[PDB]
Design an enzyme around this catalytic site. Structure first.
Site, PDB file in Angstrom:
ATOM      1  N   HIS A  51       0.762  -1.229   0.054  1.00  0.00           N
ATOM      2  CA  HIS A  51       0.078  -0.082   0.072  1.00  0.00           C
ATOM      3  C   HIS A  51       0.925   1.115   0.021  1.00  0.00           C
ATOM      4  O   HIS A  51       0.287   2.296  -0.162  1.00  0.00           O
ATOM      5  CB  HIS A  51      -1.219  -0.063   1.103  1.00  0.00           C
ATOM      6  CG  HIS A  51      -0.428   0.338   2.502  1.00  0.00           C
ATOM      7  ND1 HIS A  51      -0.300  -0.807   3.335  1.00  0.00           N
ATOM      8  CD2 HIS A  51      -0.097   1.532   3.191  1.00  0.00           C
ATOM      9  CE1 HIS A  51       0.078  -0.404   4.364  1.00  0.00           C
ATOM     10  NE2 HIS A  51       0.216   1.029   4.361  1.00  0.00           N
TER      11      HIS A  51
ATOM     12  N   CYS B  84       3.709   1.890   9.311  1.00  0.00           N
ATOM     13  CA  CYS B  84       3.468   0.577   8.405  1.00  0.00           C
ATOM     14  C   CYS B  84       4.885   0.299   7.577  1.00  0.00           C
ATOM     15  O   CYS B  84       5.802   1.116   7.544  1.00  0.00           O
ATOM     16  CB  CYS B  84       2.549   0.773   7.292  1.00  0.00           C
ATOM     17  SG  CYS B  84       0.825   1.241   7.928  1.00  0.00           S
TER      18      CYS B  84
ATOM     19  N   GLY C  21       2.368   6.073   9.646  1.00  0.00           N
ATOM     20  CA  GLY C  21       3.838   5.791   9.061  1.00  0.00           C
ATOM     21  C   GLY C  21       4.540   4.652   9.744  1.00  0.00           C
ATOM     22  O   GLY C  21       5.828   4.558   9.281  1.00  0.00           O
TER      23      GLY C  21
HETATM   24  C1  LIG Z   1      -2.947   5.134  10.900  1.00  0.00           C
HETATM   25  C2  LIG Z   1      -2.372   3.728  11.233  1.00  0.00           C
HETATM   26  C3  LIG Z   1      -2.247   3.561  12.589  1.00  0.00           C
HETATM   27  C4  LIG Z   1      -1.649   2.104  13.195  1.00  0.00           C
HETATM   28  N1  LIG Z   1      -1.533   1.270  12.100  1.00  0.00           N
HETATM   29  N2  LIG Z   1      -1.423   1.683  10.768  1.00  0.00           N
HETATM   30  C5  LIG Z   1      -2.141   2.693  10.537  1.00  0.00           C
HETATM   31  N3  LIG Z   1      -2.258   2.739   9.190  1.00  0.00           N
HETATM   32  C6  LIG Z   1      -3.401   2.275   8.539  1.00  0.00           C
HETATM   33  O1  LIG Z   1      -4.108   1.385   8.698  1.00  0.00           O
HETATM   34  C7  LIG Z   1      -3.390   2.675   6.859  1.00  0.00           C
HETATM   35  C8  LIG Z   1      -4.160   1.515   6.016  1.00  0.00           C
HETATM   36  C9  LIG Z   1      -5.421   2.088   5.603  1.00  0.00           C
HETATM   37  C10 LIG Z   1      -6.168   1.109   4.992  1.00  0.00           C
HETATM   38  C11 LIG Z   1      -5.637  -0.355   4.781  1.00  0.00           C
HETATM   39  C12 LIG Z   1      -4.187  -0.492   4.854  1.00  0.00           C
HETATM   40 CL1  LIG Z   1      -3.379  -1.808   4.432  1.00  0.00          CL
HETATM   41  C13 LIG Z   1      -3.371   0.646   5.680  1.00  0.00           C
END
Ligand SMILES: Cc1ccnnc1NC(=O)Cc1cccc(Cl)c1
Ligand SMILES: Cc1ccnnc1NC(=O)Cc1cccc(Cl)c1
Lengths: 304, 304
Positions: free
Chosen positions: B41, B145, B143
């Site tokens: 992503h 990820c 961030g």
């Molecule tokens: C904001 C955040 C916090 C903690 N862990 N991850 C975070 N990012 C996400 O979840 C961003 C995201 C949105 C839809 C699908 C996918 Cl694969 C990724």
């Protein structure tokens, strides 16, 4: 999302760990520039530990008696000296992995990471607090002596603790990097009183702010309190008295969440007086005091 | 003396972290040999995340669109490919800091360390368990990820997890290093059921053995139970059914302490039915399930 008891990344400290052997005793040393620091009791045998005369014991040792190793690297010792409860072994080679560092003496209630080591090899890393009674509740076995505690700011490692011993109660005692014990302890095999500990009030409040930020809010109530009233409750429950200095450091968390510090104190007062009622806060069934306000801000903003 | 939620030393993994930017999205990558691994992503914008066609989105990208950096080192991308939910960016330089490593898919109930990173920079390390429902309860912000989970055996890093997303419930989901999600999750911004979680029974028993080894013994009782009887209680309290395979892995702890596994099950049964009565075990007021039997043996014997 989420809030964990997080340690600092340990790589900068792993690069400094060495094994120090003197006679039959082996423990960990910290190699920074051309000096290796380690607990002075590396020069003791078991019979010496009951009442060691460190000055006399060190006089029987020469540079060549201190064997310092870090894997395939054997270090050549060109000087030795005792500073309080630490030995400083001057070596002929500066550690190529020396990070930017400082030696600091932390205050009780502050937190730091410990890199537990055995025979100069890192085994694990965990975060803990210096208790108000200057002990730490760590995880240390024989051979872990010389393992260090530290904090990191950007690229600078502030070393604050070197492990020396376990008290008969199973709690831990050690020194700053100048060899001064935290607390009343001495490096001798004698039962030693740690003294009354308390819960770190400002850290519990910081953690309740971390909880609200992460969605655990059930403990918020319709009440407020005063420092005086809160401190009567803190006294009853063996919590550190809260001061305006503590309120001031909670300012960023109060500003971010919009929950006044004294209103959070009223939530903490109600939790002390009523307990958790079988519920949890950030996966804990007790009031957590090992996160400082700075730790909460760091973790909640994603600081590297 | 003492028992802590300890993470593996993170240095070997810190040496592998890079920042990956594609378009306007920046996240973390893992640089091992001449390949950088990161969540696919990284190629999405915010509008793409609601229902991304990753194949189509990746077709609009060339090697030069993937900016990979690790401090002063900009890496030259000479190939790109998608494997399940990960991208593999071939670079022209092998990471000089590549440790000995393996990619493993862990089982639910197993534990690992997470090195939380932002923009390629490590921020902290913590230990956690893969929940029976294939989520983790981590500490991750935007961030993070691409941050990875791992275990270490001697000098070998077994990478088991790459973080991809937070569910609307605030729990975390991610993949093995071949890009296969743990659990039913997909990398899309849609609410997704995590499903019923349970407590990791074998880990709670391991932790009760760690508690007895460290002196917390108040929960030991005069009773015993059977797997069948214990499993009726496990069912009622949403604990994983205990099997002979679990009893077998608890063998070293039962041998060391002399407490038969079914006798420890009777202590756990009594704790489930009666609660803690306001007491703690290893500083916890709840039954801890994030230590495997192997973790307890490792920590109690001082393994490096
Ligand atoms: C904001 C955040 C916090 C903690 N862990 N991850 C975070 N990012 C996400 O979840 C961003 C995201 C949105 C839809 C699908 C996918 Cl694969 C990724
Ligand atoms: C066995 C052990 C476990 C945990 N931490 N430390 C440990 N070692 C000691 O306490 C050894 C020792 C004995 C008397 C005085 C001093 Cl300074 C050191």
């Amino acid at each position: 999302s989420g809030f964990r008891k997080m340690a600092f990344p340990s790589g900068k400290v792993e690069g400094c760990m060495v094994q120090v052997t003197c006679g039959t005793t082996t423990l960990n040393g910290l190699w920074l520039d051309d000096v290796v620091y380690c607990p002075r009791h590396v020069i003791c045998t078991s019979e010496d530990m009951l009442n060691p005369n460190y000055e006399d014991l060190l006089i029987r040792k020469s540079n060549h008696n201190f064997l310092v190793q870090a894997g395939n690297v054997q270090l050549r010792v060109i000087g030795h000296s005792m500073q309080n409860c630490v030995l400083k072994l001057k070596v002929d080679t500066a550690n190529p992995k020396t990070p930017k560092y400082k030696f600091v003496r932390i205050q009780p209630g502050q937190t730091f990471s410990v890199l537990a080591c055995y025979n100069g090899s890192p085994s694990g890393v965990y975060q803990c607090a210096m208790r108000p009674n200057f002990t730490i509740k760590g995880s240390f076995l024989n051979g872990s002596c010389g393992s260090v505690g530290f904090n990191i700011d950007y690229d600078c490692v502030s070393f604050c603790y070197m492990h020396h011993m376990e008290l008969p109660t199973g709690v831990h005692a050690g020194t700053d990097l100048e060899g001064n014990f935290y607390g009343p302890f001495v490096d001798r095999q004698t039962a030693q009183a740690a003294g009354t500990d308390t819960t770190i009030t400002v850290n519990v409040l910081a953690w309740l702010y971390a909880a609200v930020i992460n969605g655990d809010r059930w403990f918020l109530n319709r009440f407020t309190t005063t420092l005086n009233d809160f401190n009567l409750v803190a006294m009853k429950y063996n919590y550190e008295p809260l001061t305006q200095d503590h309120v001031d450091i909670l300012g960023p968390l109060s500003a971010q969440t919009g929950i006044a510090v004294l209103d959070m104190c009223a939530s903490l007062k109600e939790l002390l007086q009523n307990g958790m009622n079988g519920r949890t806060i950030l996966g804990s069934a007790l009031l957590e005091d090992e996160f400082t306000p700075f730790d909460v801000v760091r973790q909640c903003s994603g600081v590297t």
